[PDB]
Curated annotation (Swiss-Prot):
Tissue: Platelets.
Localization of this protein: Cytoplasm; Cell membrane; Nucleus membrane; Endoplasmic reticulum
Superkingdom of source: Eukaryota
Protein name, entry field: Acyl-protein thioesterase 1
Family: Belongs to the AB hydrolase superfamily. AB hydrolase 2 family.
Gene name, Swiss-Prot/TrEMBL: LYPLA1
Catalytic residues (UniProt): 115, 170, 204
Alphabetical list of SUPFAM superfamilies matching this protein: alpha/beta-Hydrolases
Segments crossing the lipid bilayer: none
Keyword Cell membrane tagged: yes
Coiled-coil intervals: none
Catalysed reactions, as listed in the record: S-hexadecanoyl-L-cysteinyl-[protein] + H2O = L-cysteinyl-[protein] + hexadecanoate + H(+); 1-hexadecanoyl-sn-glycero-3-phosphocholine + H2O = sn-glycerol 3-phosphocholine + hexadecanoate + H(+); a 1-(9Z-octadecenoyl)-2-acyl-sn-glycero-3-phosphocholine + H2O = a 2-acyl-sn-glycero-3-phosphocholine + (9Z)-octadecenoate + H(+)
N6-acetyllysine sites (modified residues): 220
GO cellular component: cytoplasm; cytosol; endoplasmic reticulum; extracellular exosome; mitochondrion; nuclear membrane; nucleoplasm; plasma membrane
Length: 225
């Protein structure tokens, strides 16, 4: 079968002292979000957008397409690919570790994604023990939420900043699934660093105002020097 293509890169102009790792959504590659993040780039930030492997998707009759893990249903009560989410989480952890040996400590790295890409970001951030700088979760949800105990998660990533964005006309990942997610997030990490933003009229895509809010979030958490 096919090999793992190299991630799409938005290289830093000056010495890269911070990095953003953004996971694309179903059926996509990293190339579209690479050109999106390049439009709001900062001099000292490296932007990595890895590609998901092409694999059969149970939701659409096992028709193969880029997918970080199997999708079985579109509802909060749906079955989830527990094995695949955990396995894909280790790949993302391995990708964060490849940048810390490039001279960028994990605490200067934001892990984000769109839709199932965002869902993997939230699960990876809340389970890894690498301290990260923040999470940009776009039109996504929290997978395997029932597997988290009911108190704070504790550990290296207890007060991480999370910016969750969602549109109120999204027909694929509805707003309710994002609200259910951020409410569970507020009980796992310090809710003072959790910001939820709703975009009226947006569907399962991105808006210009959202990128502006993503940029303000990354700039605040990864300033120069």
């Amino acid at each position: 079968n096919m090999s793992t293509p190299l991630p799409a890169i938005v290289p830093a102009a000056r010495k890269a002292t911070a990095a953003v790792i953004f996971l694309h959504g179903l059926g996509d590659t990293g190339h579209g979000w690479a050109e999106a993040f390049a439009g709001i780039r900062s001099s000292h930030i490296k932007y990595i957008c890895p590609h998901a492997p092409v694999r059969p998707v149970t939701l659409n009759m096992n028709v193969a397409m880029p997918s970080w893990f199997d999708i079985i249903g579109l509802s909060p009560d749906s079955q989830e690919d527990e094995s695949g989410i955990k396995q894909a989480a280790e790949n993302i952890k391995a990708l964060i570790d490849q940048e810390v040996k490039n001279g960028i400590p994990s605490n200067r790295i934001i892990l984000g994604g769109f839709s199932q890409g965002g869902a993997l970001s939230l699960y990876t951030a809340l389970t890894t023990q690498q301290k990260l700088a923040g999470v940009t979760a776009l039109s996504c949800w929290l997978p395997l939420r029932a597997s988290f105990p009911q108190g704070p998660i504790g550990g290296a990533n207890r007060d991480i900043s999370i910016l969750q964005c969602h549109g109120d006309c999204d027909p694929l990942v509805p707003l309710m699934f994002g609200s259910l997610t951020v409410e569970k997030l507020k009980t796992l990490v310090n809710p003072a660093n959790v910001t939820f933003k709703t975009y009226e009229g947006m569907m399962h895509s991105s808006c210009q105002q959202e990128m502006m809010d993503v940029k303000q979030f990354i700039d605040k958490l990864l300033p120069p020097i």
